[PDB]
Design an enzyme around this catalytic site. Structure first.
Site, PDB file in Angstrom:
ATOM      1  N   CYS A   1      45.079  84.636  -5.168  1.00 53.40           N
ATOM      2  CA  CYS A   1      44.768  84.778  -6.536  1.00 53.40           C
ATOM      3  C   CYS A   1      43.213  84.216  -6.918  1.00 53.40           C
ATOM      4  O   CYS A   1      43.244  82.971  -7.257  1.00 53.40           O
ATOM      5  CB  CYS A   1      45.735  84.300  -7.751  1.00 53.40           C
TER       6      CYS A   1
ATOM      7  N   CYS B   1      42.952  82.281 -10.180  1.00 53.26           N
ATOM      8  CA  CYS B   1      43.593  81.071 -10.609  1.00 53.26           C
ATOM      9  C   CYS B   1      44.847  80.582  -9.438  1.00 53.26           C
ATOM     10  O   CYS B   1      44.652  79.857  -8.735  1.00 53.26           O
ATOM     11  CB  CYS B   1      44.569  81.207 -11.892  1.00 53.26           C
ATOM     12  N   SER B   2      46.020  81.440  -9.492  1.00 50.05           N
ATOM     13  CA  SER B   2      47.140  80.852  -8.925  1.00 50.05           C
ATOM     14  C   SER B   2      48.325  81.592  -8.626  1.00 50.05           C
ATOM     15  O   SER B   2      49.291  81.120  -8.256  1.00 50.05           O
ATOM     16  CB  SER B   2      47.563  79.421  -9.249  1.00 50.05           C
ATOM     17  N   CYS B   3      48.177  82.937  -9.211  1.00 51.03           N
ATOM     18  CA  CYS B   3      49.135  83.898  -9.382  1.00 51.03           C
ATOM     19  C   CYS B   3      49.904  84.162  -7.912  1.00 51.03           C
ATOM     20  O   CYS B   3      49.385  84.360  -7.159  1.00 51.03           O
ATOM     21  CB  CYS B   3      48.605  85.309 -10.003  1.00 51.03           C
TER      22      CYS B   3
END
Ligand SMILES: [Co+3]
Lengths: 201, 219
Positions: free
Chosen positions: A106, A109-111
């Protein structure tokens, strides 16, 4: 050479205090319920993690009809094993083949697919991995001790929308008639992100 | 928003250090911070898109220096104030202004069911799909100051629609109270050469990104 921006740098000395102050404030205003929050922590600390994905992989390895369902409808497929929910509402399973190696990230971000892998490790959420995975996948993979054959396509999937991805790794050779259970032991979190291969027997 | 968070293709971040046998939570405070998210989303104090955009709007250096859960911590301390759920004073002092005026929506009885269900961004109907798998598309060159999910490294680039995922909420509008404006999301495949140029590329590698219908135009 300290950690600076790789996810493992030291937090501020007073972070626990700030967090405690905010928590008390939110409890006092009646915005959050401490007992409910404990159940949330327990869920991700003890009940949701890579072992879930490993069962999904193992089952797809031994059951062709399940594999087909899984590849057609990821969310329903993983639900057959009781996995579902937050950050995994719309799953897409990425099948590695001898021609194709899949890996996901991601960049924004961090998905990450919580229901099957649990919460992401710090490196997945940090700038080094995120920035470089979409430009130099091979270089990054080499740092994980994974060298993809030059002739094998690498597909990097950037999780920019509400789809969540999980890699279905290739079954290691020499694992004939293993039980799902024994197969699942071979499946590492890395192999399901695409930054590693399953363990070779 | 062309901020530090849009890292794809950036140089200088260094090696991907990975901690061996890393625990889910490296510090106790992270447990508190992580568990606050579902609690506050359940109240409807904000949606996940405003949350992302709040993290995007923290100072670039703060973003880089902060560990992951400091990002969340920043959102709770700031986004709740912007949404008028808290005042700047409450957050500074740590003390509520008028006692328990709200009631927690996330209670022990529904935690399990809520985490197991989640909240899909898929929607029944929305704008018709302009593109079909196999179509060559070019990502529009857009530079909104607000929340967006088209990564900078894809703008102006040509790729191939390889999956039509169906209709979803559009975060660009949902983050800013302009409604959901549901539309199709496609996975688009870009070649390494197309994104990075001849030199910085490998002939085999491709990059697949999920883009909303109106981010695109026929190539
Ligand atoms: Co993310």
């Amino acid at each position: 050479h300290d950690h600076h921006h790789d996810g493992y740098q030291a937090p501020p000395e007073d972070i626990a205090l700030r967090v405690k102050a905010l928590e008390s404030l939110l409890i006092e205003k009646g915005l959050v319920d401490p007992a409910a929050m404990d159940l949330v922590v327990q869920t991700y600390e003890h009940k949701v993690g890579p072992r879930n994905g490993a069962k999904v992989v193992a089952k797809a390895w031994v059951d062709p009809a399940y594999k087909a369902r899984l590849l057609a409808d990821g969310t329903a497929g993983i639900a057959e094993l009781g996995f579902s929910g937050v950050q995994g509402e719309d799953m897409v399973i990425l099948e590695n083949t001898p021609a194709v190696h899949n890996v996901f990230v991601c960049t924004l971000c961090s998905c990450y697919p919580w229901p099957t892998l649990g919460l992401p490790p710090a490196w997945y959420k940090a700038a080094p991995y995120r920035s470089r995975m979409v430009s130099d996948p091979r270089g990054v993979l080499a740092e994980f001790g994974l060298v993809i054959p030059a002739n094998k396509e690498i597909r990097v999937w950037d999780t920019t929308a509400e789809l969540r991805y999980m890699v279905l790794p290739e079954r290691p050779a020499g694992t004939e008639a293993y039980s799902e259970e024994q197969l699942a032991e071979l499946v590492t979190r890395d192999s399901m992100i695409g930054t590693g291969l399953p363990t070779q027997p | 928003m062309n901020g530090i968070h849009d890292t794809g293709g950036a140089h200088g971040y260094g090696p991907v250090y990975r901690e061996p046998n890393e625990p889910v939570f490296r510090y106790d405070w992270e447990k508190t911070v992580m568990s606050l998210l579902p609690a506050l989303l359940a109240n409807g104090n904000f949606n996940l898109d405003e949350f992302r955009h709040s993290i995007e709007r923290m100072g670039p250096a703060h973003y880089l220096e902060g560990t992951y859960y400091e990002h969340w911590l920043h959102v709770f301390e700031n986004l709740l104030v912007e949404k008028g759920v808290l005042t700047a004073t409450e957050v500074a002092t740590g003390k509520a202004a008028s006692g328990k005026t709200a009631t927690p929506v996330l209670t022990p009885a529904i935690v399990d069911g809520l985490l197991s269900t989640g909240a899909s961004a898929a929607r029944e109907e929305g704008a018709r799909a302009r593109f079909a798998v196999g179509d060559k598309v070019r990502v529009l060159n857009k530079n909104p100051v607000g929340h967006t999910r088209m990564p900078r490294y894809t703008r102006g680039k040509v790729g191939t629609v390889v999956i039509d995922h169906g209709v979803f909420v559009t975060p660009d509008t949902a983050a800013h109270g302009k409604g959901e404006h549901p539309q199709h999301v496609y996975t688009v495949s870009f070649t390494s050469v197309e994104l990075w140029g001849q030199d910085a590329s490998s002939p085999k590698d491709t990059i697949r990104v999920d883009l909303w219908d109106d981010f695109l135009e026929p190539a």
